mmCIF file of C-alpha atoms in Angstrom:
data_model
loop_
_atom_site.group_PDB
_atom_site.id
_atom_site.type_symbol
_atom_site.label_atom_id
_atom_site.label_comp_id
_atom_site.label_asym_id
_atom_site.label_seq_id
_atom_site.Cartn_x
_atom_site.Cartn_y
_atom_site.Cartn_z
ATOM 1 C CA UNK A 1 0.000 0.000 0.000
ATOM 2 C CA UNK A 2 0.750 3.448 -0.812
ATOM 3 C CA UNK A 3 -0.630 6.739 0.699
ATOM 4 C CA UNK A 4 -0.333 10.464 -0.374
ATOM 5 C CA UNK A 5 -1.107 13.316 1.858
ATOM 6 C CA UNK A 6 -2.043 16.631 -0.205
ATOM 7 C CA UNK A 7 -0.757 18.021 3.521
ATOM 8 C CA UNK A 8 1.793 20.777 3.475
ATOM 9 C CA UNK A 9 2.383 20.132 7.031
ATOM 10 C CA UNK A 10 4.325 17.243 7.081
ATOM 11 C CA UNK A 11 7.633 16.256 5.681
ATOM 12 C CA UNK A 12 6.694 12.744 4.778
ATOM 13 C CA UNK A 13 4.021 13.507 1.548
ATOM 14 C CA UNK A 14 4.004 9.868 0.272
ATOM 15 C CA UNK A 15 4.208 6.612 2.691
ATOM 16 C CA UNK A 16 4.271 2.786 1.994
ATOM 17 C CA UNK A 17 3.442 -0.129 4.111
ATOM 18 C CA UNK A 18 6.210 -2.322 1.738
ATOM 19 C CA UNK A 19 7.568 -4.397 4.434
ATOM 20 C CA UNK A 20 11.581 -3.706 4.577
ATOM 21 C CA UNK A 21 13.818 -6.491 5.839
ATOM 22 C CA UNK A 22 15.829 -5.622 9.200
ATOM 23 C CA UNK A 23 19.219 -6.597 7.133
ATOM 24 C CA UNK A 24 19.113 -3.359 5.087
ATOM 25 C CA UNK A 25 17.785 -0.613 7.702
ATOM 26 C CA UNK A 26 20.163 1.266 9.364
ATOM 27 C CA UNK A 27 17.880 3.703 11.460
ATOM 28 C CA UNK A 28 14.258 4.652 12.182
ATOM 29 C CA UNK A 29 13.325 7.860 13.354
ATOM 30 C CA UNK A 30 10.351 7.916 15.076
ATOM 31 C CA UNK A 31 8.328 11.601 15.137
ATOM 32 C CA UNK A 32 5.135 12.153 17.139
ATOM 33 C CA UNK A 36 3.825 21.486 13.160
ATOM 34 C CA UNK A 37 2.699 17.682 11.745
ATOM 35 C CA UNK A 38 -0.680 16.138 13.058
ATOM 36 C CA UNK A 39 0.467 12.610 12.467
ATOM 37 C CA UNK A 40 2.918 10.204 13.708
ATOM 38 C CA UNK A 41 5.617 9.740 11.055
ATOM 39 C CA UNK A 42 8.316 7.041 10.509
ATOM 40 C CA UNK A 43 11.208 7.351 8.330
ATOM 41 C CA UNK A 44 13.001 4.875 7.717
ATOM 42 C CA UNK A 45 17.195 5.207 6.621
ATOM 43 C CA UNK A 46 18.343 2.411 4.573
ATOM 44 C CA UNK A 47 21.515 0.693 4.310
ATOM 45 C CA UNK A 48 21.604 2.126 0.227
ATOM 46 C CA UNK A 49 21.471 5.563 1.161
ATOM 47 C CA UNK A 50 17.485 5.758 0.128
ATOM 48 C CA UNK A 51 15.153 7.311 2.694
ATOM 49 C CA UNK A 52 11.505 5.578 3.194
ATOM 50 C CA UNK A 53 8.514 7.310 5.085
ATOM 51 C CA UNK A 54 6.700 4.340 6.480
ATOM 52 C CA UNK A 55 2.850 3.864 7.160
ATOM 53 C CA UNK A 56 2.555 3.555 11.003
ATOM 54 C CA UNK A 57 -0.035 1.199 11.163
ATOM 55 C CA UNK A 58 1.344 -1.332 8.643
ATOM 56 C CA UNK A 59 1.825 -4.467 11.199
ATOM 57 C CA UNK A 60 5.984 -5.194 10.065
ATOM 58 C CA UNK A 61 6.963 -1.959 11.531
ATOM 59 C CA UNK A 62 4.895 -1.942 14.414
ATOM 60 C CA UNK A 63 6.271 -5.504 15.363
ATOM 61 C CA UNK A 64 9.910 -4.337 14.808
ATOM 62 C CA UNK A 65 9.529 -0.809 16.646
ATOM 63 C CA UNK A 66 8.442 -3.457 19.467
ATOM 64 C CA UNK A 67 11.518 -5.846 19.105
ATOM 65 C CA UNK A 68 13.673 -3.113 19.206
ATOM 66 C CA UNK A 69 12.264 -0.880 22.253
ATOM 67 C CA UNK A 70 12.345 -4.334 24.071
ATOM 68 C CA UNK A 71 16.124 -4.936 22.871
ATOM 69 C CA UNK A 72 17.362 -1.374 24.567
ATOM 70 C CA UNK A 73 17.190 -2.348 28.197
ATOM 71 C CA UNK A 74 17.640 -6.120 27.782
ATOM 72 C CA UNK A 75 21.883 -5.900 26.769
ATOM 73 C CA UNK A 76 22.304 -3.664 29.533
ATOM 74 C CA UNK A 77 25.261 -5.145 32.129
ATOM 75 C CA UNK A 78 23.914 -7.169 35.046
ATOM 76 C CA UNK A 79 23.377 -5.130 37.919
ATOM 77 C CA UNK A 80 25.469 -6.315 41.409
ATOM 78 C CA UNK A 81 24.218 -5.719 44.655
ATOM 79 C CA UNK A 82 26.148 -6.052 48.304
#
């Protein structure tokens, strides 16, 4: 799916729901002037990707990787 926003508000104007393999992402910026959540998404080819928040891939992965920031933190030691 593909979606285009006549909107002058917000910098992403066209968004897919293409599901993109973890492999080739490098970052995901996540921003909540713009009335709608927007997700752009930084791929390992230099190619930029504004991503449909409610497509289910990117929802599970924003998950997976929210979860993965406080589980390789070192062991706390008590006494």
């Amino acid at each position: 799916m593909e979606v285009y926003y006549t909107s002058l508000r917000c910098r992403c104007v066209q968004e897919s729901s293409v599901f993109i393999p973890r492999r080739f992402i490098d970052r995901i910026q996540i921003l909540p002037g713009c009335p709608r959540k927007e997700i752009i998404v930084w791929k390992k080819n230099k190619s930029i990707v504004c991503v449909d928040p409610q497509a289910e891939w990117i929802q599970r992965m924003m998950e997976v990787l929210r979860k993965r920031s406080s589980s390789t933190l070192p062991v706390p030691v008590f006494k």
